Structure formats: C-alpha cells, structure tokens
Amino acid sequence: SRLNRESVIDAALELLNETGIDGLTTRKLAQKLGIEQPTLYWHVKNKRALLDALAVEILARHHDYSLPAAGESWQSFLRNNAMSFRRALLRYRDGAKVHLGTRPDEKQYDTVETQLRFMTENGFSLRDGLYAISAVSHFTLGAVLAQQEHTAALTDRDENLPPLLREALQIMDSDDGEQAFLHGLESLIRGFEVQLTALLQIV
Amino acid sequence: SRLNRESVIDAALELLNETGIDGLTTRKLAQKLGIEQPTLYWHVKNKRALLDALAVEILARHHDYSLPAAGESWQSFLRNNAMSFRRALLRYRDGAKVHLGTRPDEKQYDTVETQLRFMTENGFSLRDGLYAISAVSHFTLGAVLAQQEHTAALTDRDENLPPLLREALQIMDSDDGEQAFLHGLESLIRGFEVQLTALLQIV
Numbered sequence: 001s002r003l004n005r006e007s008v009i010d011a012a013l014e015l016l017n018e019t020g021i022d023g024l025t026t027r028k029l030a031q032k033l034g035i036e037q038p039t040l041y042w043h044v045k046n047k048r049a050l051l052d053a054l055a056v057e058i059l060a061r062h063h064d065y066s067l068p069a070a071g072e073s074w075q076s077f078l079r080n081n082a083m084s085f086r087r088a089l090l091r092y093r094d095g096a097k098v099h100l101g102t103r104p105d106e107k108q109y110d111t112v113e114t115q116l117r118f119m120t121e122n123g124f125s126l127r128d129g130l131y132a133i134s135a136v137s138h139f140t141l142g143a144v145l146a147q148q149e150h151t152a153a154l155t156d157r158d159e160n161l162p163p164l165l166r167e168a169l170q171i172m173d174s175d176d177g178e179q180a181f182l183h184g185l186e187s188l189i190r191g192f193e194v195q196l197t198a199l200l201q202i203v
Numbered sequence: 204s205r206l207n208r209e210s211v212i213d214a215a216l217e218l219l220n221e222t223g224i225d226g227l228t229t230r231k232l233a234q235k236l237g238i239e240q241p242t243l244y245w246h247v248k249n250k251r252a253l254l255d256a257l258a259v260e261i262l263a264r265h266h267d268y269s270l271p272a273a274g275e276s277w278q279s280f281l282r283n284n285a286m287s288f289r290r291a292l293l294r295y296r297d298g299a300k301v302h303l304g305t306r307p308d309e310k311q312y313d314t315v316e317t318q319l320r321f322m323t324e325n326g327f328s329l330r331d332g333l334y335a336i337s338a339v340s341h342f343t344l345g346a347v348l349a350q351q352e353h354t355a356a357l358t359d360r361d362e363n364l365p366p367l368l369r370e371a372l373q374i375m376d377s378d379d380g381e382q383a384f385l386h387g388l389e390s391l392i393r394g395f396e397v398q399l400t401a402l403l404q405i406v
C-alpha cells in the first residue's frame with residue numbers, strides 16, 4: 001500500500017494497538033503494509049526511528065492542549081495540559097513507554113519554547129518553571145505507565161491480603177487511574193503555587 | 204554454580220546491569236550461572252517470573268526507608284520514603300522498568316499495610332492516604348524512568364534549539380535529575396498538606 005510518512009505512521013499506530021511496544025517489529029509493520037522488509041527499510045530504518053516518530057505524531061494528532069488559551073492562568077494551563085497529555089498517552093497501547101526517553105523533537109521546538117516562556121511570564125524563573133513542567137510530566141507519565149503496565153502484566157496471572165491493601169486495590173482498580181491522577185494533579189499545582197507566592201520568604 | 208533463590212537473584216541483577224531489561228534473557232542468565240537452559244528452567248520458569256522477583260528483591264536489599272521512624276511526621280515519612288524508593292530504583296539499569304506494572308508481593312504485605320495504616324493514623328482517609336502514596340510513587344517512578352530511559356536512548360544519537368529549551372536541557376542534564384526531583388517532591392507534599400488541613404473547607 002501507500003508508504004508516505006503519514007501512511008507509515010497510520011499503520012505503525014494500528015500495529016502498536018495490536019502488539020504493544022515490545023511485540024512491535026519492522027517485520028510485522030512490513031506484513032501490515034503488504035511490502036518486503038527491504039522496501040520498508042528505505043522508509044523506516046529501525047524500531048528506534050519508528051518509536052521516536054510515533055512519540056511525536058501521537059501528541060501532534062491527539063494532544064490538543066499543548067498551548068494555553070489567551071488569558072489562561074498558569075495553574076489552569078498545567079491542569080489542562082496534563083489532562084490532554086494523559087489522554088494522548090492512554091490513546092495507544094504502551095503509549096507512555098513510546099514517549100519515555102524522548103526529548104522534544106525539532107517539530108515540537110516552537111510548542112515547548114512557548115510553554116517554558118509562558119511559565120517565565122507568570123513569574124517563575126526558567127529553572128522553577130522547568131521543575132514544575134518536569135514534575136507534572138513525570139507524575140503524568142508515572143500514572144499512565146502504572147495503568148498501562150498493569151494491563152500488560154495481567155497476561156501473567158490472594159485471600160491472604162491484609163485489609164487496607166485489599167481495600168486500596170479495590171479503590172485503585174475502580175477506574176483507569178483518573179480519580180487518583182486528578183487528586184494528585186491538584187496537590188502538585190497547589191504546592192507549585194505555595195512555592196511561587198513565597199518568593200524569598202521562609203516557607 | 205549455586206542455584207538457590209539468593210544466588211539466582213545475585214546473578215540476574217548482575218546480568219540486568221550488563222544488558223538492561225530488554226536484553227535480559229533466561230538464555231543469558233543460564234550462560235552467567237554456567238548451566239544449561241533446562242537446568243535454569245527448574246529454578247526460573249520465564250523472564251516475567253524473574254522480573255517480578257527482582258522488583259521485590261531490589262527493594263528488600265536496597266530500599267531502607269520502607270517504614271516511618273517512631274514519632275516521624277507523615278510529611279517527613281513520604282520525603283524519606285520517596286528518596287529511598289528513588290535510590291533503590293536507580294541502583295540497577297532499567298530499575299524503574301523492572302518495578303513498573305508489579306503490585307505488592309505477599310512478602311511486602313506487612314510493609315505496605317503499615318504504610319497505608321500510618322497515613323490513616325495521621326488523619327488521611329484510606330482513599331486520600333492512597334492517593335498521596337500513589338502520587339509520590341507515580342512521580343518518583345516517572346522521574347526515574349525519564350532519567351534511565353534517557354541514558355538508554357542515548358545509544359541512538361541541534362544548533363536549531365530555541366533559547367529557553369537550550370537552557371532547560373543544560374539544566375536538566377546538570378545531574379541525574381536529583382534537584383528537579385527534590386523540588387517537585389516538596390511541591391507534592393505541601394499540596395497534600397494543604398488538602399489534609401482543609402478538612403471540609405472550600406480550598
């Protein structure tokens with residue numbers, strides 16, 4: 001079939017949902033595109049190059065809150081950005097693992113620069129603005145990977161549970177982690193705010 | 204060589220540091236133990252069972268702040284627990300990926316039950332206590348995986364960087380993520396505290 005960049009990425013994402021990141025191979029992508037492995041090679045040099053592109057294209061296609069709205073507070077921006085980032089990572093099997101270890105791509109430079117600038121224009125130093133963006137990013141990726149990797153490992157396999165653990169697993173498994181993620185996200189944003197507002201005051 | 208559980212785990216962790224989680228195979232563990240693959244099989248049924256055990260044994264051996272000190276505040280306990288958890292995950296190559304998707308093991312039941320009880324005895328509901336423990340856990344795992352997966356992907360490969368990104372990458376890469384992790388950890392703990400102290404007050 002068609003091997004332009006957009007068609008390759010469509011087929012790779014389709015394959016990702018069927019196989020997960022570990023079982024995703026260029027050999028299985030060739031089968032799905034109806035081509036021989038050396039044909040695919042001209043287009044897609046290895047698995048690493050494929051994963052690097054998927055990580056970019058998943059946010060391009062499905063992360064619709066990269067940028068603040070005109071006049072939006074930094075608190076509201078981080079909340080909306082994290083909810084969007086989370087949605088985009090969950091939309092594909094092993095989506096957080098696909099994002100992990102990447103750094104912003106050249107196609108993302110204007111986006112991420114605007115996010116860092118916006119934090120500095122709302123009274124954060126670059127460093128404190130970066131620490132908040134990194135904390136939100138790590139917390140959101142951690143929460144998604146815990147969800148996704150939990151699903152995954154459920155293709156492996158106690159009445160011996162002590163009672164608070166038993167109840168805690170009941171609670172954790174009552175949604176895709178949305179409740180726990182949103183509660184933690186408010187805690188993190190509020191902690192950022194207490195720090196920003198404090199200036200040089202002992203806090 | 205010796206194939207008791209402790210010797211197998213010693214050799215597997217040694218192998219993990221040489222290969223990483225993706226390149227860790229029962230076939231390479233057999234070579235390192237000087238045995239045939241069917242000998243190893245009697246001891247170690249597959250990679251999943253090995254990873255599940257390593258995840259438990261890494262914290263058993265190297266996470267020394269599982270439990271609060273007598274009279275320790277919940278704030279201090281979460282901080283010390285997160286710093287210890289982080290140290291233990293970083294001690295082996297791909298250590299966070301080894302932890303990911305596991306749930307507490309039977310050998311960890313008394314430990315994790317004590318942690319959940321301790322949060323409830325410091326005025327959290329089980330649910331709000333679990334949300335704080337999960338947020339700390341997700342944030343810490345996210346921060347470690349970002350570090351570890353960054354190292355990993357550096358076995359793949361711009362003057363075009365816009366200036367705040369360029370400076371942000373300089374900052375991020377000035378340590379193993381310790382500064383950014385500790386700053387975010389204080390933000391999260393303080394947000395937990397503002398929530399706890401608020402009770403039913405609008406906050």
Ligand SMILES: C[C@H]1c2cccc(O)c2C(=O)C2=C(O)[C@]3(O)C(=O)C(C(N)=O)=C(O)[C@@H](N(C)C)[C@@H]3[C@@H](O)[C@@H]21
Pocket residue numbers: 059063065066067081082085102103104108111112113115116133136137368371372375
């Ligand atoms: C500024 C970026 C950055 C800076 C320095 C080192 C980095 O590794 C990063 C990122 O990896 C970023 C992302 O991946 C974003 O998810 C990212 O790329 C992004 C986006 N494409 O819209 C986001 O929404 C961001 N968000 C907080 C989850 C986040 C970026 O802020 C950072």
Ligand SMILES: C[C@H]1c2cccc(O)c2C(=O)C2=C(O)[C@]3(O)C(=O)C(C(N)=O)=C(O)[C@@H](N(C)C)[C@@H]3[C@@H](O)[C@@H]21
Pocket residue numbers: 165168169172262266268269270284285288305306307311314315316318319336339340
């Ligand atoms: C209570 C545990 C739990 C409850 C319900 C579902 C879960 O998946 C968990 C865990 O996975 C826990 C851990 O892995 C700990 O890291 C965990 O097992 C642990 C330990 N062995 O000492 C920790 O120090 C904990 N810490 C916050 C990082 C954390 C545990 O609190 C939780």
Ligand SMILES: [Cl-]
Pocket residue numbers: 001002
């Ligand atoms: Cl066609």
Ligand SMILES: [Cl-]
Pocket residue numbers: 001002003004
């Ligand atoms: Cl074509």
Ligand SMILES: [Cl-]
Pocket residue numbers: 004005006007
């Ligand atoms: Cl195209």
Ligand SMILES: [Cl-]
Pocket residue numbers: 024025026027046047
């Ligand atoms: Cl491949």
Ligand SMILES: [Cl-]
Pocket residue numbers: 099100101102348349352
């Ligand atoms: Cl990452």
Ligand SMILES: [Cl-]
Pocket residue numbers: 117367
């Ligand atoms: Cl600027």
Ligand SMILES: [Cl-]
Pocket residue numbers: 204205
């Ligand atoms: Cl011996």
Ligand SMILES: [Cl-]
Pocket residue numbers: 204205206207
């Ligand atoms: Cl033996």
Ligand SMILES: [Cl-]
Pocket residue numbers: 207208209210
């Ligand atoms: Cl033993």
Ligand SMILES: [Cl-]
Pocket residue numbers: 227228229230249250
């Ligand atoms: Cl294997």
Ligand SMILES: [Cl-]
Pocket residue numbers: 145146149302303304305
């Ligand atoms: Cl996990």
Ligand SMILES: [Cl-]
Pocket residue numbers: 164320
């Ligand atoms: Cl109890």
Ligand SMILES: [Mg+2]
Pocket residue numbers: 099102103104
């Ligand atoms: Mg990123």
Ligand SMILES: [Mg+2]
Pocket residue numbers: 302305306307
């Ligand atoms: Mg765990």
